[PDB]
Design a protein around this ligand. Structure first.
Ligand SMILES: [K+]
Ligand SMILES: [K+]
Ligand SMILES: [K+]
Ligand SMILES: [Mg+2]
Ligand SMILES: [Mg+2]
Ligand SMILES: [Mg+2]
Ligand SMILES: [Mg+2]
Ligand SMILES: [Mg+2]
Ligand SMILES: [Mg+2]
Ligand SMILES: [Mg+2]
Ligand SMILES: [Mg+2]
Ligand SMILES: [Mg+2]
Ligand SMILES: [Mg+2]
Ligand SMILES: [Mg+2]
Ligand SMILES: [Mg+2]
Lengths: 55, 250, 133, 288, 109, 97
């Protein structure tokens, strides 16, 4: 259905709101990226600990 | 009122365009009613008679799907038991009554299943195949340009005598730019003839040209062919298929 | 629970910059030649010579190397129109002082390709550039 | 030109009855029939040769094979996870500009290089972008705002000599596939996703100002630029006084993929319109 | 739609070819020196059609498609009409070639 | 080795029927049609052999993948035995190895 919208869109007859993740899906996407991909602050401080430990 | 046609796409500087007469089918003697210029890179290219062999063979052996499937000794109905004990009988040793040696046995090496011969020549070779075929047709006076392709009547006998008067050979290939735009007089006249065939410009290829002894190109189709065939000289390799949107190729 | 969206047409000019061209652009005009990359455009008039050497679709001299059997080194000149035998003779006496002997060449008229035994691609490209092909 | 066309008038018409393949293109097949290729068919006399039951490839007849008596060492250990960078030489970068393949008036990034057929990137084969090499630093006279994924000291110095801007940015394989082939992505009917952060291994490379990292502190760029100018003895141009300063200062947000586009936008190419979300959660997720 | 009789592809150059060509040039060119009329160019598409069509309907011999890119000067078309064209095959040439009294040929098809 | 003693009725084949005259007309649909249909979308035949080519082993494997669930019981067994024999012959037999 999403591919038809990208092909025609106007003639596809599908609501454009279906292309974005739903609230149930958005919560799933929010948790997965947070738990697996850390933050820049966490990465920067993690490297400082190892650099101090090895030195 | 002469009908002229000057080449639109840039002709290379070191060469000059080739010219051919423009004819009309509205009358027997209505020939040489103008002059048209043909692009040298299409209608005056090198006469490659071996790049035509590859394309002509390709159009013959690219959709051939054989349907021959003989049954090997595994697929025969029976013969699941040893016919006679190997030692002591006094005859040659056998293991099944369906082996290829036996009368009713299978085939040791035969055509197996539907076999497909599908190979695609690179596109620039196929394009080069069309260019050389047109040049060969023009160089041997087998190419005639017809302006707008109209006929006085729908009688199929008119085309037969017209080709006889002008010595158009035995077979003539008539082309048109689009299917829905073909006039009713031409369609009805050529629908009852075998040696005369009408094909849209998109249905043109090497095998059809070599099948019919004479090729007829319409002036709108000539501009269509030069635009499509000269685009491959200065193009890029396809990052994604051209059916997808491109910056300057819709 | 479909969310809402806003349609705009003034933000589609960025997307038009992401479309590759299907045709090779002509080289832009430069005030000074040769260009820093060594590229030198062909002379405006066609040289008054029998044979002619077309440029590549990328606007470079069509002289290439080719190796076979791992020890056979050959130089190939492609896209030649006209009297090829004139090109062969001009090559023979051009490379004669450098080698002291006439180089071994193959002439393929059905294709329009001259094949020279050895790696002379750099010398040939300069030679054809001076003649303006 | 084609003097062979004159010969074609005298010769008869070319049809399907007289066509010959190029001589030497089709070597004939040899079948096992006759005295020569017969009674053995080129197999041998007895053994595993004539009966076709010779051992596998690499088996030396009971003796320990050559590929089993060599101790294991890690040459390809974790090769499927090592990052690869396609090299781009300044000789080729100069070559592209002279022929109009790319233009310095418009900012150049990875997408513009691909459309110019300069480099080909395969995201599947663990390619993380293009690295700038210094093969043609001496003859580089162009002025560009180029963005790559890895740069060398001499490559950066050569560009900054003419007054250019060099910036290194990291692209996740999910984003890099979109970046290299934008048109196929826009036909998938999916919102543009956020660009992911570099892993802990690649944080120092893009955070230090020596590598012109995209995540580096901008305050340390001017002092780092002057160090290269002092080191290689070239006068550092004042880039703020050039008329193309607006173009040369253009950058991308770390969460942004394309120029001027934003995560969460849907590009409807058929209608030539751009869609944007409205919900607070959708906007927050695509902008965090 | 009366069918005209089939034409014959046989051309013999007449003795007044010089006069016919120069007369045709004057009435359709009127451009260059009357003496050096054989050096006049045929580059213009309309002018070439105006000059070749008159010759075709006067000498009953039309320049084919292949040779049109060669006929660019007046001398080129003058030389073209100095070359006879024969429609008979080799056999018909042989069947009347003063054959010896012992050679007998029976064409039967 | 006895041969027939009567001349067979000569086959009067017409080279200009509908099939031969229109043979291979739209082979260049992609080249002269803005690249909208590849010439492989004109092949008529088996479902698993439209625009594909391979040896005997790759053909039998491909047939089992696509139309395997639609085949008859006896045909499904014979295909399995053909795959196993070809697998053993191609890998465990031959001269060049
Ligand atoms: K039987
Ligand atoms: K033998
Ligand atoms: K084998
Ligand atoms: Mg059995
Ligand atoms: Mg048993
Ligand atoms: Mg047995
Ligand atoms: Mg049987
Ligand atoms: Mg090679
Ligand atoms: Mg052999
Ligand atoms: Mg064989
Ligand atoms: Mg024997
Ligand atoms: Mg034996
Ligand atoms: Mg032995
Ligand atoms: Mg042992
Ligand atoms: Mg690669």
């Amino acid at each position: 259905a999403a591919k038809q919208f990208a092909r025609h869109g106007a003639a596809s007859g599908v609501a454009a709101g279906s292309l974005w993740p739903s609230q149930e899906q958005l919560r799933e996407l929010e948790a997965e990226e947070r738990e697996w991909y850390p933050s820049l602050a966490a990465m920067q401080e993690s490297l400082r600990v190892q650099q101090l430990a090895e030195e | 009122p002469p009908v002229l046609r000057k080449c639109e796409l840039p002709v290379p500087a070191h060469r000059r365009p080739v010219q051919a007469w423009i004819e009309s089918l509205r009358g027997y003697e209505q020939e040489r009613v103008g002059l048209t210029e043909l692009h040298p890179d299409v209608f005056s290219t090198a006469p490659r008679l071996d790049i035509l062999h590859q394309v002509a063979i390709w159009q013959k052996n690219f959709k051939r799907i054989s349907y021959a499937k003989t049954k090997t000794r595994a697929e025969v109905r029976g013969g699941g038991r040893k016919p006679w004990v190997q030692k002591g009988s006094g005859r040659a040793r056998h293991g099944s009554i369906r082996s290829p040696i036996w009368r009713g046995g299978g085939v040791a090496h035969g055509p197996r299943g539907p076999t497909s011969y599908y190979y695609m020549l690179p596109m620039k070779v196929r394009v080069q195949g069309l260019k050389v075929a047109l040049t060969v047709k023009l160089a041997q006076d087998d190419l005639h340009i017809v302006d707008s392709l109209e006929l006085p009547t729908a009688d199929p006998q008119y085309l037969i005598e017209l080709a006889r008067y002008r010595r158009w050979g035995d077979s003539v290939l008539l082309v048109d730019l689009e299917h829905e735009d073909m006039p009713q007089n031409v369609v009805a006249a050529t629908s009852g003839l075998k040696t005369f065939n009408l094909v849209p410009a998109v249905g043109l290829n090497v095998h059809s040209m070599l099948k019919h002894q004479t090729l007829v190109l319409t002036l709108p189709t000539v501009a269509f062919l030069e635009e499509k065939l000269l685009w491959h000289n200065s193009r890029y390799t396809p990052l994604y298929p051209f059916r997808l949107p491109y910056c300057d190729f819709p | 629970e479909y969310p809402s969206f806003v349609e705009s047409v003034d933000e589609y000019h960025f997307v038009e910059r992401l479309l590759p061209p299907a045709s090779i652009p002509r080289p832009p005009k430069h005030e000074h030649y040769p260009t820093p990359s060594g590229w030198q455009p062909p002379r405006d008039p066609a040289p008054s010579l029998p044979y002619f050497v077309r440029r590549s679709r990328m606007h470079n001299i069509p002289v290439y190397r080719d190796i076979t059997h791992g020890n056979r080194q050959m130089t190939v000149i492609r896209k030649v129109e006209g009297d090829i035998w004139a090109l062969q003779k001009d090559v023979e006496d051009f490379l004669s002082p450098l080698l002291g002997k006439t180089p071994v060449t193959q002439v393929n008229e059905v294709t329009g390709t001259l094949r020279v035994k050895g790696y002379f691609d750099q010398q040939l490209k300069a030679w054809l550039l001076e003649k303006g092909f | 030109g084609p003097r062979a066309l004159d010969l074609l008038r005298a010769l008869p018409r070319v049809s399907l009855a007289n066509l010959k393949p190029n001589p030497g293109s089709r070597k004939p097949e040899r079948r096992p029939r006759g005295r020569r290729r017969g009674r053995k068919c080129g197999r041998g006399h007895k053994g595993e040769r004539q009966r076709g039951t010779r051992p596998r490839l690499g088996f030396e007849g009971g003796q320990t094979p050559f590929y089993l008596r060599i101790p294991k060492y890690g040459f390809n250990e974790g090769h499927s996870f090592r990052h690869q960078y396609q090299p781009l030489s300044l000789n080729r970068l100069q070559y592209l500009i002279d022929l109009g393949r790319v233009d310095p008036t418009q900012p150049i990034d990875l997408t513009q290089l691909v459309n110019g057929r300069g480099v080909t990137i395969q995201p599947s084969k663990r390619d993380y972008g293009v690295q700038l090499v210094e093969e043609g630093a001496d003859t580089f006279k162009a002025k560009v705002n180029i963005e790559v994924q890895m740069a060398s000291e001499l490559a950066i110095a050569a560009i900054e000599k003419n007054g250019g801007v060099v910036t290194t940015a990291f692209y996740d394989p999910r984003s890099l596939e979109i970046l290299c082939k934008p048109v196929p992505f826009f036909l998938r009917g999916q919102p543009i996703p956020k660009r992911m952060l570099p892993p802990e291994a690649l944080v120092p490379y893009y955070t230090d100002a020596k590598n012109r990292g995209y995540l580096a502190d901008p305050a340390r760029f001017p002092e780092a630029r002057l160090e290269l100018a002092r080191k290689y003895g070239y006068v550092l141009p004042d880039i703020t006084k050039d008329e193309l300063f607006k173009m040369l200062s253009t950058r991308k947000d770390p969460r942004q993929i394309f120029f001027g586009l934003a995560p969460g936008w849907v590009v409807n190419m058929a209608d030539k319109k751009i869609l944007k979300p409205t919900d607070e959660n959708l906007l927050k997720y695509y902008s965090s | 739609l009366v069918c005209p009789p089939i034409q014959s592809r046989t051309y013999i150059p007449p003795e007044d070819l010089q006069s016919r060509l120069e007369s045709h040039v004057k009435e359709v060119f009127g451009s260059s020196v009357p003496s050096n009329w054989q050096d006049i160019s045929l580059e213009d598409v309309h002018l070439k059609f105006s000059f070749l069509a008159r010759l075709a309907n006067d000498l009953r011999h039309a320049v084919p498609n292949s040779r049109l890119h060669q006929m660019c000067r007046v001398r080129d078309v003058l030389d073209f009409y100095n070359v006879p064209v024969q429609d008979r095959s080799k056999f018909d040439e042989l069947i009347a070639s003063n054959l010896p009294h012992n050679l007998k040929i029976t064409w039967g098809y | 080795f006895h041969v027939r003693v009567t001349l067979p009725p000569r086959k009067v084949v017409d080279r200009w029927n509908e099939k031969r005259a229109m043979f291979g007309v739209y082979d260049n649909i992609g080249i002269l049609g803005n690249f909208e249909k590849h010439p492989k979308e004109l092949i008529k035949g088996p479902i698993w052999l439209r625009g594909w080519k391979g040896n005997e082993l790759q053909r039998c494997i491909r047939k089992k993948r696509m139309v395997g669930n639609r085949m008859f019981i006896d045909d499904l067994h014979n295909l399995n035995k053909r795959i196993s024999y070809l697998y053993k012959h191609f890998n465990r037999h031959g001269k060049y190895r």
